[PDB]
Amino acid sequence: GTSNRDWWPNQLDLSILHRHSSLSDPMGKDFNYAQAFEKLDLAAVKRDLHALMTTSQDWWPADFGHYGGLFIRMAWHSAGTYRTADGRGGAGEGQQRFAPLNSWPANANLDKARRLLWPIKQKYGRAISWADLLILTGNVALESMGFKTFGFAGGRADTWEPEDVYWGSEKIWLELSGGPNSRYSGDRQLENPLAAVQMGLIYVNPEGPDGNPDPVAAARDIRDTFARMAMNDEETVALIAGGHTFGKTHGAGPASNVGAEPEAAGIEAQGLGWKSAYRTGKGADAITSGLEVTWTTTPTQWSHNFFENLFGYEWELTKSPAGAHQWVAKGADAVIPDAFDPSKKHRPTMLTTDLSLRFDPAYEKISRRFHENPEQFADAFARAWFKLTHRDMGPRARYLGPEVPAEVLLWQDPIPAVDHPLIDAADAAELKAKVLASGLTVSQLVSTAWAAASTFRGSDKRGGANGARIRLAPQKDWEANQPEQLAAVLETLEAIRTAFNGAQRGGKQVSLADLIVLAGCAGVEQAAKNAGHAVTVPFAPGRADASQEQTDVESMAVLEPVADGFRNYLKGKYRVPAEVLLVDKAQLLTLSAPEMTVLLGGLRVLGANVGQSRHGVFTAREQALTNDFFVNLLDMGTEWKPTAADADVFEGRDRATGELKWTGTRVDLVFGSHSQLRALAEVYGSADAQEKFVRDFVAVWNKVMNLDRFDLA
Amino acid sequence: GTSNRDWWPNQLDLSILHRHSSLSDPMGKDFNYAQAFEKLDLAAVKRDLHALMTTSQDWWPADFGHYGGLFIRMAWHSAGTYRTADGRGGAGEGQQRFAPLNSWPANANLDKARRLLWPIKQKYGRAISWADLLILTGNVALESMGFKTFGFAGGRADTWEPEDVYWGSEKIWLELSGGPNSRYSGDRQLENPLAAVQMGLIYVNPEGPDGNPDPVAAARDIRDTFARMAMNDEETVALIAGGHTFGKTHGAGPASNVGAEPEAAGIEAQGLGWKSAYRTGKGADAITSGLEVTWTTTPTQWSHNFFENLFGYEWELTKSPAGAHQWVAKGADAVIPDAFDPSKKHRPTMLTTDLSLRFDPAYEKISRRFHENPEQFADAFARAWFKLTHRDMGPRARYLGPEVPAEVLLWQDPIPAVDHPLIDAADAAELKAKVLASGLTVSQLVSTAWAAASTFRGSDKRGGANGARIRLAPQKDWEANQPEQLAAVLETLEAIRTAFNGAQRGGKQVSLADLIVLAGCAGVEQAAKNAGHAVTVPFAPGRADASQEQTDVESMAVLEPVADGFRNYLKGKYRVPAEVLLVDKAQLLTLSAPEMTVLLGGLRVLGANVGQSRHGVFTAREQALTNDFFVNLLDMGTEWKPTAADADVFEGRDRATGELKWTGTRVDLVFGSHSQLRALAEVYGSADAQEKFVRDFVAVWNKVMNLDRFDLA
Ligand code: HEM
Ligand code: HEM
Ligand SMILES: [Cl-]
Ligand SMILES: [Cl-]
Ligand code: NA
Ligand code: NA
């Protein structure tokens, strides 16, 4: 059946914005997972999980009688898809159970892992999400095997369809670099936003880069991909050596014995895949990655044997029974237990990427430190495991349950607690009047509050206006934020704050974070008044100001907008057309297509464009909140053409005289070209739509101003 | 960006179920189009349309100074995509403005027509939908040119994204038949559910079949396609000759001068397409179809000149300036006006398909009667034009406005008015108790009500339980409906009805249509009580009983279910897997994925299967409303394998003993295989889900019972 995508494969896709509809969600539109989880008997769940560890099922028998390794890999892979560039992937939505991730090569036989969990899932029902369950199971695996975790939070709601994530352009699983859709160019530079070296891998290739078994070059891939997952050297070595203290790999026979991945399998497979024709197809005969490595002398118990082995032997290149490159300890005795036959032992073995931890000079220093000081290794791995599995959870306010660590961590972008009375409605009116009396314009007010709040992304729940990090490094210097203009606004607002706060008693004060948002709201009110309309913009106080020392500057860099169509901004020239970038930004902001439409048309007329650009400013009453953008954009009296200077800038001329009326970018004119966008534009550009436009704009404005407000959730 | 459809192109697609979300809809969730429309000043709209017909715009100058022909074609094409097989296509949702239809070759330059109506759309805003406006404009065109229409109804609500329709499997526009994705097999048999001869055409190829200019063979294609759009020979002749009384075709130069269709055009084209490099690219130089025919001596006035020409001349094969086959009148004078130069006249011309009306012997009889009796032609055309443009609107209750024709037409599947008081809540309770005391079983009651209500399709709003047409031909004899079992149930309910109606005072009575539905309600309550749950199923009275004489039996044929996965029924063997057919049915019933899931699981356990099949009956308490389908399907203790007899039937055996526990079909087991459906199944198969399951099943049941209740809208 030929589809629109087949006929026009490069047309913009709006379906990513209409995901997560109440249509596909089985739960009622009033279901609140947080509340369900808070009533869960978490202790009960953990006791059932501990039991499960050694309750071997015959359709996938437990290695060493203990599923803990398999479950730690499951949990690590759930979290391991995370990319800092967009915040997409990670464990927070349980996406491992949907396509494509349920069928990625690197996720082979994790289908078995999840199926082993169904009875517990079933027993507790909606009070524990799959998303939470996959992480909790990893934690209980660790504790069962003797490692004490740093903590655990619930609160990851399940999702009901696949997220639309860009995982790469290759059309072959696992394709090596340099092909027609290569994710690499130049000197092994991985294209943003990807965080894996091959399509269907988690970070890197366990045999080495494009399968070349060189631990030194593998290290480079490890460092790059782990950094793109928010992990530094110390955390990376802790994670890899900590993980590989447990369990084993599976490569008992040739890979050609393994059949269709789950999304490809027949209906009879009932959601499982990778059925193997090799011997019994499971247990002692399992084939997962094709490698056949067991790292330690006690694979079901926490130990210090990983680094004892890594440093205590020299390593020889060899092949598994499936033909994969791996390493065996020269001259060792058979000290490693077999997973199923007590009469068999094996020599110590390692992956290429394990050896990275010794042969890369920076990892080697850490690895040696961890070898000499195992309590430092344990603590580091505990903290990194917590980080890994909670990285995409958002502000600490979303953390649920009795095991949430009290320690505030820098990577959490912490917001101080509020310890004083908040402003009330009379205070908010007084502040808004002070802001309007200062001279700050509608454009400056809207611009600033937009800059502050629109850093939020729903993918990992980072960013937003809470924290007033816009006044700190690096946000205060981002080009999109207009640093010299922003400085002038902030100085004025900081002076209003100081003067208000100085006049109060009883402890009441206003945060700068709140005042930036309130000032934005005053701008939008003033803009409606310029248009002749009375309007009230909702405002909720309670943001606090974070410090520079609570703001990791390098971690904040990934939130910098290099494209923000809502301010007609593009930092440079990209392969991806700008209207694609606009929809991606709308998805991050959690906007529907109608919300994106109304918001952009109103920001254009309010003066929110970077640099005061006239592109898309289709109004003769700038700073007035009107539907002018849509009425003018849709006027057939104007003809558009690209400029000779720049194919991405368009001039709109009167069709009868030739005279120039407007200029616009691709982001502006896609609203008059895409047949779904134009249908939305028509609604707001109709003669009966002025009040609808204003009301819808205020609602979306407020939505954006509250995106990170999980303290009100 | 590689997608799940790329990796697994044959996996089932659930996205068709979650179209029409409130996410993509810009109107508020309380917007009611009927209420907006009823206050429109329709007369004012029609005056503006009248004025528009002769107000030429220079970017697409009006032929003969009059847009009427263009607008008639626009409206004809809006309606003309309708297929009786599934009810999809048609004018009722305004889909011509979206992909793919907006860029079908047969829709070339209708982009211009729609753009001409923006100023009126803009003026009246949400009070007139685009869907309604396209058809209204065709009517105003006709009236302006001296044709008296049969009437007009408003009430087609706009849609905001493309419908997912199967339009064919060709990957090339206009591909001739006999290609690798040919829609023809055997002796020119067009595959169901298609209703056009080539991808991107409305009915037939105006040059002749696959371009062969033979009017006799063209007539075969005309008859077959028009029959598949619910039109008989008289209506077909009347429509084609009626339409081609007006206007002209456009083929002034070679087709290679025509550029990209709207969906492929540059952003600067602002949603228009087919920009032509031929001379001025428009007006006298226009190219649309490539044919260059003007049918009558007065292209802007109703006449009987089409048949005067068709029959008054002999015809010669010729070529347009674009190279297309067309016909010209042998030895004629230049009597046809030129569209822009009053000093030029042309000989009469015809398409191959126009000549069909004379050279096919059955058409010729009708055409000659219409020639001799033009008043009969005008009445036929007016009736056909109303049917064409309203065929997908649904019951007469949805018809809005002051121009609705009072004559009730047979193709409307009309329902008689109710002229008596309705039963009240106590009456309904008394009747449910009478039904349960009769000895009718849960299975009989559920199955009968299902059979009655589940004929509805939201594509054209035909079917449903209103009418009690289940007791009439042909419904009473459909295989799916289990004719002998059904007859026994109906006899018992008719006796209950008679006894209740006979006891009343005051004119109160219950229709059989209502009692079928209510009795199904009693069955579902009784099933719930069998499971230990007291529930009340909602019921709304007001259905009426239609007569056999008010039921067109041949039109009702297309509503027969040949696949109904909700009753585990497949009338024969199809190319399309049964699960795909299930999702198609769910879409026709307007069900979401969660609604389809709950509905199916509950019907299985209530005994709704055709023929009392055990397939999918995963319960040991049949006729009790429980979640047993889901709990048993999802039990990893059971292993499934296709049977040697039949690859589409599966046995479920205990994994340990081999013992046979169940059998199922693809429709049953897809809920354990597809990753999104299994996630839905898991929610209802959880230990906490019994109350939820009941509540949700009752809700979806009542939704189905009420699909055709636009009297309560
Ligand atoms: C450079 C990064 C890493 C690479 C290339 C890698 C590679 C792999 C491979 C290929 C397997 C074998 C899959 C099989 O055949 O069953 C595996 C097993 C596993 N990995 Fe990793 N790993 C990485 C980092 C991690 C991390 C960060 C963790 C957790 C903190 C982890 C924990 C595990 C464990 C527990 C297993 C054993 C599975 C079982 O016993 O069934 N690894 N690893
Ligand atoms: C066998 C069925 C049909 C065939 C093959 C067909 C073919 C076409 C073609 C090829 C054109 C020219 C497009 C252009 O170049 O501008 C057209 C024009 C037109 N058709 Fe049809 N037609 C059919 C039925 C109908 C029907 C049922 C109606 C309405 C009742 C209709 C009304 C018109 C009108 C009014 C025009 C003139 C458009 C203008 O003046 O711009 N046609 N026909
Ligand atoms: Cl994601
Ligand atoms: Cl449709
Ligand atoms: Na994420
Ligand atoms: Na339809």
UniProtKB/Swiss-Prot annotation, chains A, B:
Enzyme Commission numbers on file: 1.11.1.21
Cross-referenced PROSITE patterns: PEROXIDASE_1 (PS00435), PEROXIDASE_2 (PS00436), PEROXIDASE_4 (PS50873)
SUPFAM superfamilies documented for this protein: Heme-dependent peroxidases (SSF48113)
Site (Transition state stabilizer): R73
Cross-link (Tryptophyl-tyrosyl-methioninium (Tyr-Met) (with W-91)): Y203-M229
Cross-link (Tryptophyl-tyrosyl-methioninium (Trp-Tyr) (with M-244)): W76-Y203
Cofactor(s) listed: heme b
Active site feature: H77
Cited InterPro entries: Catalase_peroxidase, Haem_peroxidase, Haem_peroxidase_sf, Peroxidases_AS, Peroxidases_heam-ligand_BS
Domain of life: Bacteria
GO CC, any one term: cytosol
UniProt binding sites for heme b: H244
Quaternary structure, from the entry: Homodimer or homotetramer.
Name of the protein in question: Catalase-peroxidase
Organism, scientific name: Burkholderia pseudomallei (strain 1710b)
Gene this chain is encoded by: katG
